[PDB]
């Protein structure tokens, strides 16, 4: 009883310290000193009428890059922590047959829909990460309703690194002029750009980077649950 009550005392003074430190404003309006520039200059400077997809890939452009660095490092870390050259399933203990056939037919129903999330970062919220995580969910449904379902690894992490390279090759061929400069809507480099401003001609540069990052994070968690469902 000594440790729990003493922790409750110290954590109560921590919470009181944060709550006294939370006396900035009672949910008021006066917060944006630079944040108004993000809103008033998002319809004409990037093309994406979405607010968050233009600020995190174009404005804070080195932060979805650190994000995919973190997810790729989680893949290679779990793969380095679990490595035995055998990689067998557990006991597989079948259990049901409306589950295997249940996740069979439902597997392209999530494969269609997860792609729909990351192609649409224009009028729909989100970005590449919920669509990639539910692509990994579809991989998990086929992985937790079958007796093996080993997607071939030699040829699996190739496209993950290829999609991360596809991000960075837009930064490196983006280095043909300046830092990022979008390479796609402001100069007719490979195709056209800035048709209108709706969900037509795909806005500016932000959709194809979300297809590539959604493909990267789509094969991300599926590899993690793959090499963590492997016994001796």
């Amino acid at each position: 009883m000594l440790k729990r009550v003493l922790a409750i005392l110290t954590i109560l003074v921590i919470g009181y310290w944060l709550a006294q430190g939370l006396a900035d404003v009672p949910f008021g309006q006066d917060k944006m000193v630079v944040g108004k520039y993000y809103l008033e200059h998002v319809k004409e400077e990037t093309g994406a009428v979405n607010a968050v997809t233009a600020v995190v890939v174009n404005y804070r452009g080195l932060d979805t890059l650190g994000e995919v660095t973190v997810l790729f490092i989680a893949s290679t870390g779990v793969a380095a922590l679990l490595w035995k050259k055998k990689r067998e399933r557990t006991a597989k203990t079948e259990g049901s047959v409306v589950l295997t056939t249940g996740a069979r037919l439902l597997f392209p129903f999530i494969a269609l829909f997860g792609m729909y999330i990351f192609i649409h970062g224009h009028l729909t919220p989100g970005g590449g990460f919920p669509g990639g995580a539910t692509i990994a969910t579809a991989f998990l449904l086929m992985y937790l309703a079958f007796t093996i379902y080993e997607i071939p690894h030699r040829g699996f992490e190739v496209t993950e690194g290829l999609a991360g390279m596809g991000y960075v090759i837009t930064g490196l061929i983006g280095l043909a002029i300046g830092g990022y400069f979008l390479f796609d809507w402001i100069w007719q480099t490979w195709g056209w750009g800035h048709e209108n401003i709706g969900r037509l001609f795909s806005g500016g540069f932000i959709p194809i980077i979300y297809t590539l990052i959604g493909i990267k994070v789509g094969t991300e968690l599926s590899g993690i649950v793959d090499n963590m469902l492997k016994e001796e």
Partner: protein
């Protein structure tokens, strides 16, 4: 120009004698790498009378103003000659190539502390000197070596603490101008400065609280190295206390009221010096070893300098620096002669050799100069040095402190009689028939220190007139032969010639013939009895058992035991903090994070 070359030259000599181990040339070109500072100092000796010689070399962003004063040259001149007289005796007694890298780095530390006129050259050279001496004695008996290293790093780094405080409180770092601003506040934070500076230079002296490195670091080592380990590597403590007097004397006398005609900080350092001469002489008696006996000798004569450079603002420094030159000059010869007798023969302990004064008469005669150079003999520098120290005591009257330094001259006399008895006289054991004479390269150092001793003793004289003028306007009106004190004279011409006349009249009453037939030693008295060769008749076991049993209470309280206690307490606290703070409990580190977050709540 001509000043920085002599500071890199023993460093370059330590550098060059590492690659050149191909032939028998690491001796020859190695020893003349340390023999150029005498040629460069005496080349710049007449330019001392001209306006002073300095140099800056702004390196590391610091100042490093090296400059050579009237007295820093004097300590550097004995630095060159004592560091020479060991190092040409160091061309033997090495049995490796990893000796010259450190024993020449130490001399560049020694010339650095003496030619230090700033502080950022001072502590750099002091740290280099400490390291070189440690790594010299870091070849065997590690526990003896590391004790010296921990103590001298504590002294060096407490000096870094004291220089941090005196750089904070003043603002400026430069040592020439920092005496001016202490004059500026000469008309509660400074009793720490003096005491920490005294602990900073009680590590390279014989101070009775902290001298336990001396019976180990002056003990087992290269013995031919050791002539600079006491001859210049213990003068750096003397020059430290003298630089403290060059920093402030009056500012430390107003904040600390005088106990008598002597200043109380000078009285404290001279009282610890008088205790040093007492304990150094007494522990030199019951110390059966050839070098552990001489460790207490080397720190016995330091207390003379720290008594003279304690009390008395006139003539006190002027007599203590004289004994500093004299003592280092003959103790170089004593460590040279003990290195010769430890190299030519075998083992170390007194129960190995005796009566070894006929197989090597060059050794015997050269240290007969040194026996005369100690404890007071009127042709030699020992009597001049001790007489100057006793002259500085009576002025600014001190009766309680004059007794222990006079007792120190007595106990300085006593141990040398203990040395020259069971090492040099008596019978010889039958393992010393396979021995030779003294080699020449140690004998050149013996002859150099002997001729320098005889020109030092019979006429002070040249060094007295040197340290008199251009520094603390004259207390002594000396000449080439006399000394001319304010109330004493101490002639040297008509004091040595009355000896050599008195030895002639003594030889007249002896050199008369009538049968002077030599006899063997094995046939002797033995209470009128037969005595063979296999009788240990010369005594060699402790020699002073009533002296030990007189003060058998005083020797039960040593300081070797206390420092090992305090270090074992720190070392077991090191095992304590290892297991307490650094647990395997993850939640312990979570609790540590919650505690420091709670401190951030407390603001």
């Amino acid at each position: 120009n001509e000043l920085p070359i002599i500071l890199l030259s023993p460093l370059i000599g330590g550098a060059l004698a590492w690659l050149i181990r191909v032939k028998g040339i690491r001796e020859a070109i190695g020893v003349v790498s340390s023999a150029i500072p005498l040629y460069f100092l005496i080349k710049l000796y007449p330019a001392l009378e001209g306006e002073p010689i300095r140099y800056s070399l702004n390196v590391g962003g610091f100042e490093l103003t090296l400059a050579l004063s009237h007295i820093s040259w004097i300590f550097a001149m004995i630095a060159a000659v004592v560091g020479l007289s060991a190092v040409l005796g160091l061309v033997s007694t090495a049995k490796d190539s990893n000796e010259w890298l450190f024993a020449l780095m130490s001399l560049a530390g020694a010339l650095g502390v003496f030619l230090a006129n700033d502080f950022v050259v001072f502590f750099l050279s002091w740290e280099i000197m400490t390291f070189a001496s440690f790594m010299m004695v870091f070849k065997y008996n590690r526990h003896a070596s590391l004790k010296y290293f921990v103590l001298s790093i504590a002294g060096a780094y407490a000096m870094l603490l004291a220089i941090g405080i005196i750089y904070a409180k003043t603002g400026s770092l430069s040592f020439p101008e920092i005496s001016a601003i202490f004059r500026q506040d000469a008309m509660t934070e400074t009793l720490l400065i003096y005491a920490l500076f005294l602990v900073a230079f009680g590590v390279k002296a014989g101070m009775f609280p902290l001298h336990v490195w001396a019976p180990d670091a002056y003990s087992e080592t290269n013995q031919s190295y050791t002539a600079m380990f006491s001859g210049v590597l213990s003068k750096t403590g003397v020059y430290g206390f003298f630089l403290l007097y060059l920093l402030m004397y009056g500012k430390l006398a107003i904040t600390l009221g005088n106990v008598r005609s002597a200043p109380t900080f000078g009285y404290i350092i001279a009282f610890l010096g008088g205790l040093t001469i007492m304990v150094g002489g007494i522990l030199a008696a019951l110390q059966e070893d050839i070098r552990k006996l001489f460790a207490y000798s080397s720190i016995s004569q330091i207390g003379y300098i720290l008594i003279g450079l304690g009390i008395g603002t006139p003539l006190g420094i002027a007599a203590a620096t004289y004994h500093a030159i004299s003592h280092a000059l003959f103790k170089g010869l004593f460590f040279l002669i003990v290195a010769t007798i430890i190299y030519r023969t075998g083992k170390t302990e007194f129960k190995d050799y005796g009566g070894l004064a006929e197989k090597m008469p060059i050794t015997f005669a050269m240290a007969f100069v040194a026996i005369l150079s100690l404890a007071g003999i009127p042709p030699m520098a020992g009597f001049a040095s001790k007489w100057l120290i006793f002259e500085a005591v009576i002025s600014r009257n001190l009766p309680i402190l004059g007794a222990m330094v006079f007792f120190g001259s007595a106990i300085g006399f006593v141990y040398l009689i203990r040395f020259t008895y069971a090492v040099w006289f008596g019978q010889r054991p039958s393992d010393l028939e396979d021995v030779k004479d003294a080699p020449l390269p140690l004998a050149i150092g013996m002859g150099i220190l002997a001729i320098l001793n005889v020109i030092f003793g019979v006429a002070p004289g040249l060094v007295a007139r040197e340290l008199n003028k251009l520094f603390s306007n004259p207390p002594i009106g000396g000449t080439i032969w006399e000394l001319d004190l304010g109330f004493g004279r101490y002639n040297g011409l008509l004091l040595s010639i009355w000896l050599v006349i008195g030895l002639i009249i003594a030889a007249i009453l002896y050199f008369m013939g009538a049968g002077v037939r030599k006899v063997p030693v094995t046939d002797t008295y033995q209470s009128g009895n037969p005595v063979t060769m296999e009788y240990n008749l010369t005594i060699r076991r402790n020699f002073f058992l009533p002296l030990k049993e007189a003060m058998a209470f005083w020797l039960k309280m040593s300081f070797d035991r206390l420092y090992h206690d305090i270090w074992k307490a720190i070392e077991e606290l090191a095992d304590l903090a290892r297991s307490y703070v650094y647990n395997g409990n993850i939640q312990a580190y979570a609790w540590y994070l919650a505690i420091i977050l709670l401190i951030l709540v407390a603001m």
